[PDB]
Amino acid sequence: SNRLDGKVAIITGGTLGIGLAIATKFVEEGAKVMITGRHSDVGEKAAKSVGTPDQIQFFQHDSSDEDGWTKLFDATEKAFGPVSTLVNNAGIAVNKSVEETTTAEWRKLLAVNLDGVFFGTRLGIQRMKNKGLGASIINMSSIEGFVGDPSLGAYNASKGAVRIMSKSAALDCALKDYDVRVNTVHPGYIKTPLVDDLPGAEEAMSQRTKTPMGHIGEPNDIAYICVYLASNESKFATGSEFVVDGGYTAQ
Amino acid sequence: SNRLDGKVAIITGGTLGIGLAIATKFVEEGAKVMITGRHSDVGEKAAKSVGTPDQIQFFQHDSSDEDGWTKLFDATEKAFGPVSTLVNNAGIAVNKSVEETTTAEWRKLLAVNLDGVFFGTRLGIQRMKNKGLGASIINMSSIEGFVGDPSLGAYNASKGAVRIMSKSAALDCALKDYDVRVNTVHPGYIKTPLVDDLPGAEEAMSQRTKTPMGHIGEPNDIAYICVYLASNESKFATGSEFVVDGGYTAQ
Amino acid sequence: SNRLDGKVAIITGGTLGIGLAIATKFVEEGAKVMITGRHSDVGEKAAKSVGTPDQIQFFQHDSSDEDGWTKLFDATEKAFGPVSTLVNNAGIAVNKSVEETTTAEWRKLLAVNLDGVFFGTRLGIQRMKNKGLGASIINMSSIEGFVGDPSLGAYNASKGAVRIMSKSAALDCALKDYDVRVNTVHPGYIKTPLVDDLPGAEEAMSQRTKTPMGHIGEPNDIAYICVYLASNESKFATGSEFVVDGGYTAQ
Amino acid sequence: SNRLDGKVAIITGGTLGIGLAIATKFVEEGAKVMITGRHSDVGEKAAKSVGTPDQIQFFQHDSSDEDGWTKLFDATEKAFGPVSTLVNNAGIAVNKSVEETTTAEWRKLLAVNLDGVFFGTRLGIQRMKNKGLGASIINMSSIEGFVGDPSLGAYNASKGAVRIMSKSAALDCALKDYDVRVNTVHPGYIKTPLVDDLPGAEEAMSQRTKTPMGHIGEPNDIAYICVYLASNESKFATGSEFVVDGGYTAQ
Ligand SMILES: [Mg+2]
Ligand SMILES: [Mg+2]
């Protein structure tokens, strides 16, 4: 309770799934939140479901849209004051091996999962540093930032990039005393409506050879590690990877 | 607040420093705690400083003492009910390169830092599994479980061992549905009275080439990640390494 | 001696530095080699400096040029027969933090260091699979695929991406029994004429806080690990990272 | 051919399997070799199977025997001159989870797999430093130094320890300009006569969920990486881990 007192957070892809759970717990611990998403119909319903406009608002945005990032920050500042916390959560996947990935698929995925994370991280550092906010940038990877999957080629590329880029940003921010931390979170498989929509997906992910726990996680498993990283409890963590994966990467 | 509702924790080396901060925050979040340490004079004062006997007690023990482990568990059960949570925190260091380590130094260090962790982990699994406790075993490494230090040879050995042994235990516990998670925590340098006692130590550890933040951490930086791992918030994390190091290992 | 009997290799950025040493040793070990580079004057002179056209040729190419990759594979086949070995070595750097990277610098570095490696890996799998060649794709990272550097933000993103994408491609090729291995090489600092042109650069890179050996490496340190990976000596190695760094990443 | 000109190597557990293939290739590449093993009958026959006494000899030793290590180095010097290269290959396994490991099994496995490697590394540094030998210490781990296995608890502890202790020793040797490199080798599953004696073992280890290549390796896959590490070809490699696993750890 009140673990995020006074924080102001942007969560990209905050209207569904993992993003939405992050938002929900952020609001519960006292943060002001701006969630983003591509569809206003979903976005505005999501925001209202979590709380009132003085707690949480929606902002329509594609994380691959560089200019929209500037608008997003300005809007969040107008609503809630200076942003302290950024969760780069929006992502997409392509279910293809490297061999079978088209160039269009490659660029589309990178623009969200890599360029978007870059735009958010770069803008977040510039806007959040040197303000005594206890600022924190939480970049969503994946277990796919640690291990390959033969049918997630471009996704693996994007998540390996976010992993190491985040260390670079962490170190610069530390060395320059910016009061900004940057860390990555690496979910294993997580049960969401989208997973429920793909027959047999949870069942495959729940095989012991994939997830040793023999079941997949839930959105709140990611929201709780994000609360920790956004909070000043984690003021000495920067440049680190936080895995919450049911044992996936342990074997 | 009440993040450790109903938990019963053993924290080895709980009377000083990082251990003591863990204990303090554990009690604050509603856990019952048994702290261990080598000296009763220090131990009993430490326990009373944190709370009353129905919250926290001391138990004298050297973590390298296999038979004492059994007593420790029995005592903790007698005081507080079934143990749910084990923090293997007790450790020592030897300030020697591998080349310059005597065999006596080697065995002494291993007996605490490796055998002790093994005895605790093995006994913890046996006593905690299959009880619906939400059991959690948190094994203290180190940044020295990731990277070498030329003057910490045996220490590096012990911390690399704990790191991977912990994954083995994690996986067995998961695959057998024991309801026990095992994870490791990897502090960077942390300011304690013992560090304050070694002239120039904090100053050396605070050089940017060591810790990018340009200062070292404090005991509560470790206590907070331990609260998370002991709590059911982290029910999908097992077999993972959690680093809190000021950027040390990021560069 | 004759460690690469019968192999046919493409080495991108093969006209200078690391690439040129790889090419030199490849030819010494009996491979046929196509080197690429941006300047025809340089490339032709480099090929002739190594051997005759029956051993080594040049093909002008920018590794970001998708169509030109098809032309390079066609050309190499026409000269030497079916390609067995690809070294994705071309790369560029931007000396900027994430915070200070322009979008143009981001895209230009990614086009070479990431898209180019994708284009080469994808086409290499297509062309080399299922031909009993003992095919091997060697993707040049860097130490910057393991650790961050505060002033190499885009470069870190690109080297992280190559690291994990290469595991994805390894796994698919193994699972499909393609007779293609994929592995990464991670040089630390290496002395080249370009380093020699920057006063003080080698000395800085040779500080013990950077390279524990107290000096930097030479192009042949990367050529020898590449001969191992290209040869059938490494037939059981796939999806692995091979680091040759003077200790940089060990501390 | 002549890749180990002038070298003098000790290989522990050199009479069978991986060790014997290392010894065979070492001799083929011009090294002088002392192999160790427990059974004199086996050892003498193995040495003679590889070459003559001017190329290779046997010394009976249990790698847990501290004093015998001094005797082994003395003996090797007397036969061949100053030792340049040490391969710490001897090891044993216990097929138990952490939970089910007796203390006796723990101590017996650690004495060989951990203390023995310490004793060899320590004495090797002492003996090989500062002699212009291009000295190289190659510590055999395993994939079990990266990932856990639920039924190899003590083995995982020992392989984690060797992994990181070896980085400590690398760093000290580099920093002190000792002309000693230390690196680890991490085999995945390898076909030997001992595997062949367990019905079904190879088939199980060859499942794609274990080894993506769908088959296991052979002793020469580990011998070739060891020739690279022992040779001056790898003069800039220290403190690194070299994995040869058929993809095991990539997924
Ligand atoms: Mg795995
Ligand atoms: Mg480092």
Contacts of D171 in chain C (CB under 8 A): 212, 247, 250-251
Best probe of the C interface among A119, A165, A249, by most C CBs < 10 A, is A165
A65 contacts A15 by C-beta, under 8 angstroms: no
d(CA B168, CA A119): 39
**Residue D228 among the catalytic residues:** no
The one-letter code for the residue type at C142 is S
Q: In whole angstroms, how far apart are CA C154 and each of A204, C114, C240, D159?
A: 35, 10, 23, 35
Distance CA A195, CA A218 (A): 11
The token duo for A141 is 């990877």
What is the C-alpha radius of gyration for chain C, rounded to an integer number of angstroms?
17
Residue A127 distance to chain D (closest CA, Å)? 38
For helices A153-175 and A116-128, the axis angle rounded to 10 degrees is: 10
Strand partners, B63: none
In this structure, what token pair is assigned to residue C163?
Answer: 């690291």
- Residue C124 CA to residue C34 CA, distance in Å, equals 14
B61: left (phi over 0), alpha (psi -120 to 50) or beta: beta
Q: How far is the CA of B78 from the centre of ligand 1 (A)?
A: 41
Contacts of A159 in chain C (CB under 8 A): 164
Cα–Cα distance, D233 to D21 (Å, whole number): 20
Distance between CA atoms of C111 and A236, rounded to whole angstroms?
35
Determine the distance in angstroms separating the CA of A225 from the nearest CA of chain B, rounded to an integer.
8
**What is the C-alpha separation between A164 and C144, in angstroms, rounded?**
8
Identify the burial level of D54 via C-beta atoms within 10 angstroms of its C-beta, where 0-12 means exposed, 13-18 middle and 19 or more buried.
exposed
- Helix, strand, coil percentages, rounded to 5, for chain C: 45, 15, 40
Task: Specify the pairing of strand D135-140 against strand D180-187.
Answer: parallel
- Cβ–Cβ < 8 Å for A240, B250: yes
* Phi, psi for D9 (deg, rounded to 5): -115, 140
The single-letter DSSP state of residue C183 is E
Instruction: Give the strand pairing for B8-11 and D8-11.
Output: unpaired
D18: amino acid identity, one letter:
I
CA C246 vs CA C161, D130, D139: distances in Å: 23, 18, 17
H-state helical runs in B115-152: 116-128
Residue B214, Ramachandran bin (φ over 0: left; ψ between -120 and 50: alpha; else beta): left
Residue-wise DSSP of A82-142:
S--EEEE---------STT--HHHHHHHHIIIIIHHHHHHHHHHHHHTTSSS-EEEEEE--
| Alpha carbon C22 to its chain's center | 9
Q: What is the CATH number of the domain that holds A152?
A: 3.40.50.720
Q: Which domain holds residue A244?
A: 1-251
Q: Which of D156, D139, D90, D147 is nearest to D240 (CA)?
A: D139
Residues A180/A235, Cβ–Cβ less than 8 Å = no
CA of B251 to the centre of ligand 2 (A): 4
Instruction: Report residue A48 as tokens.
Output: 């209202």
* C145, C123 contact by CB (below 8 A): no
Q: Which amino acid is at A213?
A: M
User: Does D55 show up as a binding residue in the annotation?
Assistant: no
DSSP assignment of C41-91 equals: HHHHHHHHHH--TTTEEEEE--TT-HHHHHHHHHHHHHHHSS--EEEE---
Q: Which of B119, B148, B166 sits opposite D167 (nearest CB)?
A: B148
Q: Tell me the CA–centroid distance for residue B236 and ligand 2, in Å.
A: 29
Among chain C residues, the shortest Cα distance to A107 is held by C115
C-beta atoms of C160 and A162 within 8 A:
yes
Chain C residues contacting D, CB < 8 Å?
1, 167, 170-171, 174-175, 177, 188, 208, 212-214, 217-218, 221, 224-225, 228, 233-247, 249-251
Give me B237's structure tokens.
């994390």
Q: Please count the CA atoms within 13 angstroms of the CA of C113 that sit on its side-chain side.
A: 27
Across the interface, whether the CB atoms of D99 and B169 are under 8 A apart is answered yes
Using alpha carbons, list the distances in angstroms from residue D119 to B205, C244, D70, D156. Answer: 30, 26, 9, 19
What lies within 8 Å, CB to CB, of B195 at 6+ separation is: B189, B201, B202, B205, B216
Resolution (A): 1.5
| CB-facing half-sphere around the CA of B100: CA atoms within 13 A | 11
User: Residues C36, C37, C39, C45: is their CA dihedral positive or negative?
Assistant: negative
Q: What is the largest CA-CA distance in chain A?
A: 49
Contact B25, B101 (CB under 8 A): no
Handedness of CA D99, D101, D102, D106 (dihedral sign): negative
> Residues A72, A78, A79, A80: is their CA dihedral positive or negative?
positive
The whole-angstrom distance between A148's CA and the closest CA on chain D is 5
Torsion-angle region of residue B185: left (phi > 0), alpha (psi -120 to 50) or beta?
Answer: beta
Phi-psi region of C121 (alpha: psi -120 to 50; beta: other; left: phi over 0): alpha
Q: What is the CA radius of gyration of chain D?
A: 17
A187 backbone dihedrals φ, ψ, rounded to 5°: -60, 140
Ligand 1 centroid from CA C143, angstroms? 22
Q: Is D38 annotated as a binding residue?
A: yes
Torsion, Cα of A74, A79, A83, A84 (10° steps)? -170
**Secondary structure of residue D217 in the 3-state scheme:** strand
* Total domain count, chain B: 1
Catalytic-labelled residue, pool D155, D224, D228, D248: D155
